[PDB]
Design a protein around this ligand. Structure first.
Ligand code: R68
Lengths: 20, 350
């Protein structure tokens, strides 16, 4: 499922913005 | 019918006049910012509530009142080094000039030889981010309570020619009453016409930002869509382990919705997450009103949200002042002030 794919990803933590 | 047409056709006149008076108040403090309204040694430093590139936000106590605040401490030297003077200067200049029920209030700001300081209202609810992940997701009425605050917040900022550029649960603090206080104006910019910098959080980036197109206000409305999708689903519409995979998903033109999303949500979302700028809500002839009048918002008393007369579907555990249960734990670093002034010219206007 899409929710398991998310939970198993490395983007579930606190996310940082970029500056190119 | 006819009572809601007198109500609707009158709410709008109140709004035209609210905004005009808001543009005057903003312009006054924008053309003449408050500087040096406090000092470091007036606060006791207790705990880190968060971090970023050049420093950290801390729970602090103002000794004369015993009022708790959240102080952002930036190291001037790292800012110069990363070529972000302008962005740090926009942040303070904008916070000190803005004023709205869902914007974190700046109380004081100052500088010393080493650092910049911004002292803001403490929101002991912690970030939306934290409750969104713990709980999994929010119900649509719960998401909509929050979304409506964002819609009006952007209506405000966009009227001031401001663009926020960093919408995401991490930057949406929850106050003691369960309402939103947006923070982290690091990416905000006052702008008439086009701007070009590639910045923002990958997940929330609008296509015209990824494509170096030169862009405007409308990237915030794209971001609102990402937020409402993440709130309602427990995950964002576009994700992947590497950013370059996120970007291509965003520009593909394509989105999939959970089977639990209502049709109204899916349809609101199809119009916010629209690659074609001529078709994206927030960006058409009628502006924000296309979003306000959308079916998903049928239950929203826009005036009652502005006035905070609606019940927050989630008021956090408030174990008294200076408590940080709703916040994560971070490594602490001692604050070191130098005897030599650094970067004085670069930061004169702060
Ligand atoms: C826009 C980016 C992030 C792009 C990458 C390069 N730096 C840029 C950038 C621009 C401007 C900046 O001021 C900074 C910072 O140095 C910075 C420093 C500290 C923080 C920070 O701790 N903010 C916390 C935690 C991050 C998530 N947002 C919530 C925020 N906390 C609060 O603001 C808060 C408010 C009230 N009560 C409690 C807390 C955020 C940013 C900064 F890092």
């Amino acid at each position: 499922t899409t929710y398991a794919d998310f939970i198993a990803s490395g983007r579930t933590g606190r996310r940082n913005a970029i500056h190119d | 019918g006819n009572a809601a047409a007198a109500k609707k056709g009158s709410e709008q006149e109140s709004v035209k006049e609210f905004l005009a008076k808001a543009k005057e108040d903003f312009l006054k403090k924008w053309e003449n910012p408050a500087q040096n309204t406090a000092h470091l040694d007036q606060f006791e430093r207790i705990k880190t509530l968060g971090t970023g590139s050049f420093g950290r936000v801390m729970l602090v106590k103002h000794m004369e009142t015993g009022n708790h605040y959240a102080m952002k401490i930036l190291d001037k030297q790292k800012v110069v080094k990363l070529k972000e003077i302008e962005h740090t200067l926009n942040e303070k200049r904008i916070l000190q000039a803005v004023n709205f029920p869902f914007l974190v209030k700046l109380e004081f700001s100052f500088k010393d030889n080493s650092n910049l300081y911004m002292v803001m209202e403490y929101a002991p609810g912690g970030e939306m981010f934290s409750h969104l992940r713990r709980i999994g997701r929010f119900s649509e009425p719960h998401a909509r309570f929050y979304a409506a605050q964002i819609v009006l917040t952007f209506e405000y900022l966009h009227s001031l020619d401001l663009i926020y550029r960093d919408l995401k649960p991490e930057n949406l603090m929850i106050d003691q009453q369960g309402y939103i206080q947006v923070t982290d104006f690091g990416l905000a910019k006052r702008v008439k016409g086009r701007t070009w910098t590639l910045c923002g959080t990958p997940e929330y980036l609008a296509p015209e930002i990824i494509l170096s197109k030169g862009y405007n206000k409308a990237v915030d409305w794209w971001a609102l869509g990402v937020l409402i999708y993440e709130m309602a689903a427990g995950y964002p519409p576009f994700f992947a382990d590497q950013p370059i995979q996120i970007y291509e998903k965003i520009v593909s033109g394509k989105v999939r919705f959970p089977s639990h999303f209502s049709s109204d949500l899916k349809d609101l979302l199809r119009n916010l997450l629209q690659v074609d700028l001529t078709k994206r809500f927030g960006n058409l002839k009628n502006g924000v009103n296309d979003i306000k009048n959308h079916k998903w918002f049928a239950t929203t008393d826009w005036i009652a949200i502005y006035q905070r007369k609606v019940e927050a579907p989630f008021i956090p555990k408030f174990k008294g002042p200076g408590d940080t249960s709703n916040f994560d734990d971070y490594e602490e670093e001692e604050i070191r002030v130098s005897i030599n002034e650094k970067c004085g010219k670069e930061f004169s206007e702060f």
